[PDB]
Ligand binder design. Structure first.
Ligand SMILES: Cc1cc2nc3c(=O)[nH]c(=O)nc-3n(C[C@H](O)[C@H](O)[C@H](O)COP(=O)(O)OP(=O)(O)OC[C@H]3O[C@@H](n4cnc5c(N)ncnc54)[C@H](O)[C@@H]3O)c2cc1C
Ligand SMILES: Cc1cc2nc3c(=O)[nH]c(=O)nc-3n(C[C@H](O)[C@H](O)[C@H](O)COP(=O)(O)OP(=O)(O)OC[C@H]3O[C@@H](n4cnc5c(N)ncnc54)[C@H](O)[C@@H]3O)c2cc1C
Ligand SMILES: C[As](C)(=O)[O-]
Ligand SMILES: C[As](C)(=O)[O-]
Ligand SMILES: C[As](C)(=O)[O-]
Lengths: 541, 540
């Protein structure tokens, strides 16, 4: 041999991602014991060596579109690696697509939070297959606009048996649902959709057009927007007909994507595809409003989990990798970088779960409903859009191996932009935040009141900043991103206080609410012990 | 047809990346006429459809390691797509590996700046093949430590004829040089290297060990660190022997990289590889100090070019893509986001080229030499490390297509971290700054005087901030990144004043030096006039 291999970091595999995360455990502290037991088992699974192999395979053995069979007939099939189906099977059995719609007494009053904690853990393992599960869970809220259609589909949708066979949906053990919104001329401006729907025999509708981005193409049906005589309408469009034949779907290509690669995203064209209208004619936008809101929470929770998993690897690496004779984690500068990132990961996780809590409490508490209506785009804006910069710095903490695809940080870095881009990007979230202030000032008083209650009298200066930003946004729409980010900082700070993470909150408040312009991590002085921040959030395991 | 395809952005291909960049033209305003002509031709090349096809192919048709031939002999060859060799050929013919060492009277007093302007443009086209050119240009500063080896190798190294054949080095039309430094147990702590060098017949040395990341493996020789009885020493190690036979290189694998994929990076093991010592025994670290410094300017210049190119695409898209009946560039919020990114790209470009100017003036100006020694890690820290976050936001400005690999932003986003990581990352740059503060505080006094002269009396508040940061860093090594980033902000602001970009400087100073903690772009109010910033830096 020419050399020895020394000073290598042992893998994080085999430990428990839930029990290694005290902030998450505090977030779940009031869950019933049965949920704690399930989260510990989930925490063990997502760091197991077998699960990590499935995640690597799903993202390297990529889905393939087969437009035709060997004799020249169209079949419009997308084939996946078995690893994809194994992840789907377990997450569907776990109810990640269905549990908020189920009647489970152990989760009463906690359905969004219980699911969000599971979602957060799974996103640390493999994020791509979460897309069909997010769309399936959220799609049922659109189906509520037509209760007969909900009653018809929900038994099949809520089934916890995953079924990827090419049977018609009504013969499958369970079904999944997708979304056909974006067209080539725009995904934001859905009223510019040119897909058209025309009445057909039997009260159905026939659709002709295209959708430029349709993820999870082997879903059994798709919520789709199309124009009718009275405006943009929403439809439930099955991929297959009752005998299993194609329903006018023509897949053109799969996207060659930066990340999210385990999840096939197709370009599709429709020729006479038959479907049911969902909601009132011309009310397509209103019909899908609650569906989109549900996907935005998932985008935040998953981005937070992505950041958590990437930073845990950086902290763990620092504890074992020696440089100049001692572990990297004993270097003051590495301590400041790791602790500074931990503050944002902590704030993003607390805020994302606080939004889930507002969803659970909205029906019984007007102030929580106010938070739920107005802050979903704030949380999606900030949590998702900080992930690329933070995951890059976490990757840099690994040195050269961090840049190599046989690890996890490269894949997570490639993944991070998708949650921010996939549905409403930053500018769309921020304008949404400003519109709600223009139409419902009372909602932001309620949020400001919750923030002020948690920060206490010392936080009144932050409240004044937020009011000034709200008022300035009415003067100038261009400052809507400033308003959105400041709201997120303040709400994350408030929740860290609510959770009792007072050392974390102190340092978070001093920097994000009191510090100066910065562009890189590590902007902490010695006033707060950095090693304590790191040990509190990433205890050595 | 089922639908019409409408509201699409016309391609930016076919225009001129140099003439479309007023800040760059201002930076080059005093270059001789012949240099202006050459930059205009390069500006057209990097946006031409032909060149763009080469850049795409070089990054999708990946190099393959061939350890053996089909009969089972070791050959240790790496094969590239012809597009890689075409980019190398043109860049070598342009002297990107050699021009600072040439005696070109047209570039007298400007060698580093003239090369940096070319580098900036080429990085907008294809960054991966720049790695061997950066290493080759920088390697000559180390070879100077042994002047007889410099005389022996420099005609071949400085040749503008690219030659990728498998001939021995002195039978080729020109040669390139790489770097064998990082080992599995560490790339930062090179004194923990375990590769060993032993005396051989004829005054040569035999090396046995491994290098964990060796880019451009078909380079003709590599500057390599290995242990001798006196400590860590530097060696020039040819890949092939005098007859074209293997010189004890055993390539194991190529890295499967996030980005930079046109540039092969190998894992290699050395078994009795014959080389020449460069510099004194045990002085390997000192010998490669200037070589490393040169590569650090290149990292900054290229990262600035990456950012410039990605933001130019986002601005161009906004001018053509309609949403809600008007161009995106007419939406106030999109204007704030684009302008806010433009301020960092302008500051990073100005600061990087200002470092190049310090390199040109160092031999004749003590204040400029002080700037070059103390601020090289500052520029590399800030310019390279802001690129990932900025290129993500630029990608988001394109919408869903931004995330797709048939465009350019996804590749640039994957490229962006490599300049920060490839040689000394942020923590290493910041500790470099802290060491210079500890061992030679007067160098930063000179930097502050230069900043103060450019900012004018209005800037005393920024000087006081920098003094406080210097004092605090002497107290606490842990705040070294704060000192480093504040120095970059202030020097970027000062250089924008030096360039006469006073509207850009005004807006940059008020935000980066006077604003609040932020994590995303778009933090400008109406006083900064976002549309004028965009039109001044990215004219349609
Ligand atoms: C991996 C992936 C999967 C996806 N899956 C699906 C799917 O299953 N179904 C589906 O229908 N779509 C899907 N999408 C598409 C996605 O929803 C769209 O890209 C998104 O809606 C934006 O639409 P666009 O690309 O047309 O951008 P545009 O509408 O052209 O917007 C471009 C940019 O301008 C900004 N902008 C927009 N409006 C304004 C304004 N008023 N003022 C200022 N700035 C503005 C946007 O925020 C964005 O940054 C997916 C996207 C990705 C990347
Ligand atoms: C694409 C690519 C190409 C490369 N090509 C080459 C090449 O051709 N030749 C070559 O020899 N190398 C090459 N490298 C290797 C590269 O130079 C090393 O990754 C780098 O030197 C860091 O070494 P490391 O991975 O061992 O990290 P480590 O030395 O283990 O450090 C890991 C992390 O700790 C930080 N750190 C280190 N010391 C300290 C400290 N004292 N205090 C605080 N933080 C600290 C680092 O900044 C980094 O964040 C390449 C790397 C990449 C990504
Ligand atoms: C609504 As069904 C899948 O049971 O036909
Ligand atoms: C960060 As804590 C409140 O779980 O110690
Ligand atoms: C961007 As300018 C140097 O023309 O002000």
């Amino acid at each position: 041999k020419t050399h020895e291999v020394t000073n290598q970091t042992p893998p994080i595999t085999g430990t428990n991602a839930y029990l290694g995360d005290p902030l998450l455990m505090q977030i779940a502290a009031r869950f019933p014991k049965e949920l704690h037991t399930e989260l510990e088992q989930a925490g063990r699974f997502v760091l197991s060596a077998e699960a990590q192999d499935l995640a690597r395979l799903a993202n390297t053995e990529l889905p393939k579109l087969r437009t035709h069979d060997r004799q020249g007939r169209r079949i419009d099939l997308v084939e996946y690696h078995p690893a994809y189906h194994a992840l789907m099977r377990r997450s569907v059995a776990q109810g990640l697509h269905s549990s908020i719609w189920e009647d489970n007494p152990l989760e009463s009053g906690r359905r969004h939070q219980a699911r969000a904690a599971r979602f957060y853990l799974t996103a640390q393992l493999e994020a791509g297959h979460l897309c069909p599960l997010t769309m399936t869970s959220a799609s049922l809220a659109a189906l509520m606009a037509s209760p007969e259609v909900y009653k018809q589909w929900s038994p099949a949708v809520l089934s916890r048996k995953y079924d990827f066979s090419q049977k018609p949906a009504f013969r499958k053990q369970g079904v999944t649902l997708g979304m056909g919104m974006t067209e080539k001329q725009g995904g934001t401006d859905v009223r510019a959709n040119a897909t058209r729907a025309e009445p057909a025999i039997g009260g159905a509708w026939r659709l002709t057009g295209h959708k430029w981005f349709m993820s999870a193409p082997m879903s059994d049906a798709f919520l789709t927007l199309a124009q009718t005589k009275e405006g943009l309408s929403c439809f439930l469009l099955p991929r297959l007909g009752e005998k299993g034949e194609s329903n006018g779907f023509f897949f053109q290509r799969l996207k060659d994507k930066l990340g999210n690669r385990s999840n096939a995203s197709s370009e599709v064209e429709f020729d006479g595809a038959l479907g049911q209208m969902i909601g009132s004619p011309g009310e397509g936008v209103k019909t899908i409003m609650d569906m989109v809101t549900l996907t935005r929470l998932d985008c935040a929770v998953a981005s937070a989990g992505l950041m958590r998993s990437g930073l845990a690897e950086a902290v763990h690496h620092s504890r074992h990798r020696h440089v100049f004779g001692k572990p990297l984690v004993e270097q003051p500068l590495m301590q400041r970088v790791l602790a500074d990132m931990a503050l944002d990961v902590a704030g993003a996780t607390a805020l994302s779960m606080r939004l889930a809590r507002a969803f659970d409490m909205a029906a019984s508490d007007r102030a929580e409903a106010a938070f739920a209506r107005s802050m979903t785009p704030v949380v999606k804006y900030w949590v998702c859009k900080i992930a690329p910069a933070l995951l890059y710095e976490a990757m840099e903490c690994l040195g050269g191996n961090g840049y190599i695809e046989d690890g996890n940080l490269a894949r997570a870095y490639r993944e991070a932009p998708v949650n921010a881009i996939w549905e409403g990007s930053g500018n769309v979230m921020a304008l949404d935040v400003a519109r709600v202030l223009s139409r419902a000032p009372a909602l932001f008083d309620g949020v400001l009141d919750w923030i002020s209650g948690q920060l206490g009298p010392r936080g009144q200066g932050t409240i004044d900043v937020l009011r000034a930003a709200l008022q300035l946004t009415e003067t100038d729409q261009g400052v809507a991103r400033l308003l959105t980010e400041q709201l997120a900082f303040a709400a994350a700070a408030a929740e860290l206080r609510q959770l009792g993470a007072d050392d974390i909150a102190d340092a978070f408040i001093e920097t994000r609410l009191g510090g100066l312009w910065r562009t890189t991590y590590g902007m902490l002085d010695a006033r707060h012990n950095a090693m304590r921040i790191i040990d509190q959030l990433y205890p050595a395991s």
